[model samples]
Target: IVGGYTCGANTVPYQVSLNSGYHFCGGSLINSQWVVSAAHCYKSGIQVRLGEDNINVVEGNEQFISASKSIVHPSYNSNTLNNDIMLIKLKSAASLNSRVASISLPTSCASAGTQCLISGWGNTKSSGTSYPDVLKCLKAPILSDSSCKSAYPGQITSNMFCAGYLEGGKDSCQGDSGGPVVCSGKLQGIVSWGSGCAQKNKPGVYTKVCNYVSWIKQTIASN
Candidate 1:
């Protein structure tokens, strides 16, 4: 976890480590067997570790599950990165417990300026490449799309939303892609892309999860 403090154990149960021998991305458990992540995060040998807090050691409460398949969004544009979302179907549904549970999807859009929580194991230092051994979290405020579009002219779209501080001291960074952005006790966004890690006036960007709920539901039902 980087740019934030260590998260309380078993508090964010849906937080997951998307590992391929090592953690390449972060994800959130949307259901017993389904995980939601970034399409750009797709890679070989990805495994989902539920209830994981410390990456250096496997806790007794954790459940290691192999991915059966990864379904990237059909309309995902790697070039423009328009639809930057994906779903992973676990080989077996997770056994629910206190430390392992699913996060609820949003029923509506998160209002602009809503304060949210983002958790990940990304870089602590913006220019650093090293990762943390434990999960970290930060409070991010949902910024107006107008502000985001101003920063990223002709880049921000309706399918996406922006979050972070206007002062720009805190944000999700490298290796934090595909992690959860929970707002108002719901899964509102997914850590998708950003200009840089915690740069001045450059806040973190996220996929507006509420916009793709229909697609997500259909995909999970079919898979």
Candidate 2:
């Protein structure tokens, strides 16, 4: 994240890290055995880490599970980055506790002005260097479609919404996609992508979780 800081241990127990060779992406634990992320963040060798804050540690509260499935949204667009969301079905259920748990999903997303929280082990600066060992988080204010489009014209879609700043500060950067954008203690969005790091007017774009609530429900139910 751009202009971000390290969070306390287990700050977001539902936060899941996807590792392939090294850290690749992030997701939110929707249930004991399912993690939701971005479709575009998909790649092979992905493993899920839950409960713990530090990636390098192997704590008792942390759970490591292999991904049994990577289900991408059928209508996902690579070029347009629409429907950029997915689900990772874990092989084993995660053991729940104070240090490890799933986050609540929104029946309806929070208001546009709500303060949303995003967490990840992504970049700390715009140069795409210095990924954090400990999880990092930021409080980003939601931006309206028009306000978001002003920064990314013709790039906005019904499947997407944006959060960040018009002042060229605070954003989720590389390795942050497919992560949670929580508001009102519920999952509201998925970190999808952005122009660069924290460029002026370029708020970090995310998959609108509320738009696909039905699909997510059905997908998980049928899986």
Candidate 3:
């Protein structure tokens, strides 16, 4: 789940924000008021910036929102990387503009073998340096349930999903964690884990957005 990459290379088209200076990855604009991301991204007094190319270049046309609260999945375990998900409730709703738009989450689990797109600022190659000021994206096919189950045996649970090239060439790297895995223009997964950056015999793992729909709705309702 970890790969080396530089910070603030380019901007992601999706309405999400990275931890200031690219420390952690988080999604943005699920609704008028909420942003989805990994729980681990939350740290004390972290700053959230929107519509900016670089962290240090905050001058004009950029929106910075303070996080009022962070809600991470209680089941998230750092060691096993289980339940690696969270939501960031902004102090207020962001003003919608051309640069800010919320992505749609899947209403149901996509069938296996679905083609999806993953985007982030992670390392380009295994053990490679993280890119600076650029966002890289790649395509991966969702693995069949049987194939995914066989790959990890006991590690992959019902809450997780898998995607990536089996032969190895493209994938989501370390800095990409908590980023969106989109299918049909809807968010279907969150980058979770992998054997290594684009390694053979291992596929990129993600938190299944469909399985958590009830929890998401309930959580948002409570807020």
TM-scores for all predictions = 0.97, 0.96, 0.86
Which pairs clash inside model 2?
A: none
Provide the clashing-pair count of each candidate structure: 0, 0, 11
When 1 and 3 are scored with TM-score, the better candidate is 1
Model 3, residue 72: displacement in angstroms?
1.0
Candidate 3 Cα outliers beyond 4 Å, as residue runs? 1-12, 20-22, 52-61
Model 1, range 77-170, lDDT digits (tens) per residue? 9877788899999999999987898889999899888999999888888776777888889988899989999878888988888899767668
Question: Across residues 90-173, which tens digit of lDDT does each residue of candidate 3 receive?
Answer: 787777676666778788788788998787655666766655345556778899877777777778878788888676666788
- Lowest summed lDDT window (length 10), candidate 2: 52-61
Model 3 clash number: 11
Which runs in model 2 stand beyond 4 Å of their true positions? none
